[PDB]
Scaffold this active site. Structure first.
Site, PDB file in Angstrom:
ATOM      1  N   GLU B  55       0.787  -1.224   0.000  1.00 52.81           N
ATOM      2  CA  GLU B  55       0.000   0.000   0.000  1.00 52.81           C
ATOM      3  C   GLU B  55       0.823   1.280   0.000  1.00 52.81           C
ATOM      4  O   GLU B  55       1.971   1.294   0.437  1.00 52.81           O
ATOM      5  CB  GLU B  55      -0.914  -0.001   1.228  1.00 52.81           C
ATOM      6  N   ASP B 227      -6.107  -5.012   9.516  1.00 51.25           N
ATOM      7  CA  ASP B 227      -5.883  -3.725   8.871  1.00 51.25           C
ATOM      8  C   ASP B 227      -6.073  -3.792   7.371  1.00 51.25           C
ATOM      9  O   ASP B 227      -5.480  -3.018   6.622  1.00 51.25           O
ATOM     10  CB  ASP B 227      -4.465  -3.249   9.177  1.00 51.25           C
TER      11      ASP B 227
HETATM   12  N1  LIG Z   1      -3.022  -0.680  12.961  1.00 45.77           N
HETATM   13  C1  LIG Z   1      -1.804  -0.295  12.549  1.00 45.77           C
HETATM   14  O1  LIG Z   1      -1.493   0.910  12.436  1.00 45.77           O
HETATM   15  C2  LIG Z   1      -0.771  -1.344  12.201  1.00 45.77           C
HETATM   16  C3  LIG Z   1       0.694  -0.927  12.196  1.00 45.77           C
HETATM   17  C4  LIG Z   1       1.531  -2.105  12.606  1.00 45.77           C
HETATM   18  C5  LIG Z   1       1.228  -3.319  11.958  1.00 45.77           C
HETATM   19  N2  LIG Z   1      -0.141  -3.624  11.552  1.00 45.77           N
HETATM   20  C6  LIG Z   1      -0.589  -5.044  11.770  1.00 45.77           C
HETATM   21  O2  LIG Z   1      -0.152  -5.560  13.041  1.00 45.77           O
HETATM   22  C7  LIG Z   1      -0.097  -7.048  12.965  1.00 45.77           C
HETATM   23  C8  LIG Z   1       1.095  -7.527  13.680  1.00 45.77           C
HETATM   24  O3  LIG Z   1       2.263  -6.896  13.101  1.00 45.77           O
HETATM   25  P1  LIG Z   1       3.745  -7.397  13.543  1.00 45.77           P
HETATM   26  O4  LIG Z   1       4.765  -6.584  12.828  1.00 45.77           O
HETATM   27  O5  LIG Z   1       3.851  -7.548  15.012  1.00 45.77           O
HETATM   28  O6  LIG Z   1       3.731  -8.901  12.909  1.00 45.77           O
HETATM   29  P2  LIG Z   1       4.521 -10.220  13.292  1.00 45.77           P
HETATM   30  O7  LIG Z   1       4.283 -11.199  12.185  1.00 45.77           O
HETATM   31  O8  LIG Z   1       5.908  -9.848  13.654  1.00 45.77           O
HETATM   32  O9  LIG Z   1       3.829 -10.711  14.629  1.00 45.77           O
HETATM   33  C9  LIG Z   1       2.451 -11.220  14.676  1.00 45.77           C
HETATM   34  C10 LIG Z   1       2.386 -12.281  15.762  1.00 45.77           C
HETATM   35  O10 LIG Z   1       1.045 -12.726  15.801  1.00 45.77           O
HETATM   36  C11 LIG Z   1       1.086 -14.083  16.164  1.00 45.77           C
HETATM   37  N3  LIG Z   1      -0.198 -14.665  15.809  1.00 45.77           N
HETATM   38  C12 LIG Z   1      -0.808 -14.972  14.593  1.00 45.77           C
HETATM   39  N4  LIG Z   1      -2.012 -15.503  14.728  1.00 45.77           N
HETATM   40  C13 LIG Z   1      -2.265 -15.575  16.042  1.00 45.77           C
HETATM   41  C14 LIG Z   1      -3.414 -16.062  16.821  1.00 45.77           C
HETATM   42  N5  LIG Z   1      -4.497 -16.564  16.257  1.00 45.77           N
HETATM   43  N6  LIG Z   1      -3.267 -15.954  18.197  1.00 45.77           N
HETATM   44  C15 LIG Z   1      -2.197 -15.455  18.838  1.00 45.77           C
HETATM   45  N7  LIG Z   1      -1.077 -14.979  18.147  1.00 45.77           N
HETATM   46  C16 LIG Z   1      -1.154 -15.054  16.748  1.00 45.77           C
HETATM   47  C17 LIG Z   1       2.234 -14.670  15.338  1.00 45.77           C
HETATM   48  O11 LIG Z   1       2.652 -15.946  15.706  1.00 45.77           O
HETATM   49  C18 LIG Z   1       3.226 -13.521  15.440  1.00 45.77           C
HETATM   50  O12 LIG Z   1       4.262 -13.725  16.446  1.00 45.77           O
HETATM   51  C19 LIG Z   1      -0.119  -7.373  11.430  1.00 45.77           C
HETATM   52  O13 LIG Z   1      -1.341  -7.985  11.037  1.00 45.77           O
HETATM   53  C20 LIG Z   1       0.097  -6.005  10.750  1.00 45.77           C
HETATM   54  O14 LIG Z   1      -0.386  -5.897   9.450  1.00 45.77           O
HETATM   55  C21 LIG Z   1      -1.116  -2.604  11.906  1.00 45.77           C
HETATM   56 NA    NA Z   2      -6.998  -3.326  13.734  1.00 49.46          NA
END
Ligand SMILES: NC(=O)c1ccc[n+]([C@@H]2O[C@H](COP(=O)([O-])OP(=O)(O)OC[C@H]3O[C@@H](n4cnc5c(N)ncnc54)[C@H](O)[C@@H]3O)[C@@H](O)[C@H]2O)c1
Ligand code: NA
Ligand SMILES: NC(=O)c1ccc[n+]([C@@H]2O[C@H](COP(=O)([O-])OP(=O)(O)OC[C@H]3O[C@@H](n4cnc5c(N)ncnc54)[C@H](O)[C@@H]3O)[C@@H](O)[C@H]2O)c1
Ligand code: NA
Lengths: 340, 341
Positions: B55, B227
């Protein structure tokens, strides 16, 4: 492994390949990509308008590669010794989101625009074309001139620009090409008289009638490149009604192109369909054809892939740490907060 | 154009400190959110693929333009790649000139934690002290510290399907003795009796990380993980039992948890809460949900902050991304003769 091609490196790359071959090879690459039009995730570029200009993001992608270009359009910039158009872009991997190449695209934009105009003319202009009018002799002018001269047989160019020094620059830059004669005209009407092709690349953020109905002659092809934003045009609305109009990406061109001056239902022809031989391009020798060009992300995708391949073969470009690469624990971003 | 790469940002963040960075950024974000109406806002443009999304997030005011390139690929960690990678640019509006090019992967975690903090300060009960942290990946440490250092959270109960992720989180913050982080064996167990639930899980699908039966009066949900359309963490009925707050409504209606609710489902604009035009939390027993998906203004703020912080430290490298001032700006052709010519 994010490679970076800066301005001087792109300069060396273009110099090595040669401007003529670069444009020719790019036009061929653009033609093939346009034929694969329906394989791309397309969208109208996002524009952020300001008082004296615009800043836009132009994304596009297929199933394996993603590309986007950042570009501005500030006609008043030249008064401050800045380029009207400045741009850079990225080519990325779709399945990982990793940015493989970050590249300057100011020089590349002029090259892809000239190549796109050439590709359209090859398909739309009468094959016997030899004389072209070049209105606007700024940054894009030399590239457009060479594209048509080296690849479309244009032997004579009649140029005009409100700024006589711009025209002098153009003539001086291309004098080295003895097979091409370029002469200064005192007005647009004088420059376009008897030409086979009219290329307009003027920069003025306003509705302008550079070309008027009275200037049209049977069989002409208009390469309208300058206008490329809502409220920014170069052709009188009636010029379009007296021609078969061709566009890049219709949804975007309806808003930014010359056709923005006509009803939403004014008929236009998709260039990619013509290139696939599925829709008629030029229908007769007397017809006037118009390429309502505003620029489209797919063209930048093509030049980005071309640049990556050509730079790789020449071992050009440098690596930069734009985003994390492969790591032992990609979930430990916090480790980066302890310093390099 | 100046460039701040990954290692340079690492040194910058290290010198400022993660907590101070988040605190100062939250203050800056609050100021920008207050002048919400001064920005040319738009929903980010997304290019979807089978395993992720790429994006572009632009925004601009009368003086500065900013945009961030960012991907979201949950499967990337299995290939030792980050789920989230990003970089962006801060440019001058009246010329279009790009002043700063910067890594934004580390910065994204910082601005997301700052945004979650800012929202929580206005939406969570002021007496919150315990938080559940579901998802212990890249974003987790930042979220944990933001809440511990700036919102009085002294206890975090963490859960992640990947046990090594939770171990990483605990080890990374062990030095903060005022913060207790313990591992739970399930989401239900982790959220029991907490004041705030922060979800930052990465799974490209409709997930019901949080179900209505887990809700307790007075909870605040910092829903950050979902997101993108088709990517959620909350059961739709969790939303029906709460006052829901958003960043930029047009975008969130498409990408947020509320994508699962009627287009008419009432939501509250966070910037208006901050301005005091509408209420944040209205009662101690109310359940509040910050349906966070990320918004360009937040990246605009962090880019400006990074530029200011780097500038006073003389950090960053000059790069020739675009032409600067030249004798004849109309002579682009001269650049085709090689850097020597
Ligand atoms: N809202 C925002 O502004 C924003 C900005 C940051 C990232 N994002 C979102 O945040 C999320 C996490 O980002 P990140 O960099 O930490 O990713 P990451 O992949 O480093 O960590 C995600 C963690 O979630 C765990 N996970 C997956 N499914 C699960 C479940 N059902 N139960 C428990 N744990 C589970 C994984 O094992 C992993 O350790 C992503 O989906 C990303 O797109 C959103
Ligand atoms: Na969210
Ligand atoms: N269609 C596309 O894909 C595409 C890509 C290239 C640039 N753009 C557009 O092309 C135009 C030219 O770009 P450039 O980089 O050469 O700009 P430039 O500012 O370097 O040159 C434009 C020239 O037009 C001249 N001019 C302005 N008004 C005129 C008029 N009424 N009559 C005659 N000459 C006039 C100026 O004096 C100037 O020398 C711009 O409007 C730009 O936004 C379009
Ligand atoms: Na045009």
């Amino acid at each position: 492994m994010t490679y970076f091609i800066d301005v001087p490196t792109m300069s060396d790359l273009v110099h090595d390949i040669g401007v003529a071959p670069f444009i020719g090879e790019l036009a061929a690459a653009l033609r093939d990509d346009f034929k694969r039009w329906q394989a791309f995730d397309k969208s109208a570029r996002v524009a952020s308008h300001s008082e004296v200009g615009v800043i836009e993001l132009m994304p596009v992608a297929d199933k394996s590669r993603y590309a986007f270009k950042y570009v501005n359009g500030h006609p008043a910039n030249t008064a401050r010794n800045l380029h009207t158009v400045m741009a850079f872009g990225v080519l990325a991997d779709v399945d990982s989101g990793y940015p493989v190449l970050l590249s300057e695209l100011t020089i590349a934009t002029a090259l892809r625009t000239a190549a796109t105009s050439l590709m359209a003319a090859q398909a739309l202009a009468r094959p016997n074309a030899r004389k072209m009018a070049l209105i606007g002799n700024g940054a894009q002018s030399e590239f457009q001139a060479l594209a048509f001269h080296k690849h479309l047989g244009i032997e004579e160019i009649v140029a005009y620009d409100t700024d006589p020094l711009a025209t002098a620059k153009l003539i001086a830059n291309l004098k080295e090409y003895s097979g091409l004669t370029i002469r200064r005209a005192s007005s647009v009407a004088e420059a376009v008289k008897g030409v086979d092709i009219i290329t307009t690349v003027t920069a003025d953020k306003a509705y302008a009638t550079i070309i008027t109905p009275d200037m049209l002659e049977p069989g002409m092809h208009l390469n309208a490149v300058g206008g490329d934003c809502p409220g920014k045009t170069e052709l009188h609305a009636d010029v379009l009604r007296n021609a078969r109009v061709f566009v890049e990406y219709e949804p975007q061109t309806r808003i930014e192109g010359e056709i923005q001056q006509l009803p939403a239902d004014f008929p236009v022809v998709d260039l990619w369909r013509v290139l696939r031989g599925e829709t008629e391009g030029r229908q007769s020798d007397s017809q006037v054809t118009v390429f309502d060009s505003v620029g489209f992300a797919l063209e930048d995708y093509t030049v980005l892939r071309y640049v990556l391949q050509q730079a790789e073969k020449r071992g050009m470009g440098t690596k930069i740490d734009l985003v994390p690469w492969v790591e032992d624990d990609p979930k430990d971003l916090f480790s980066h907060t302890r310093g390099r």
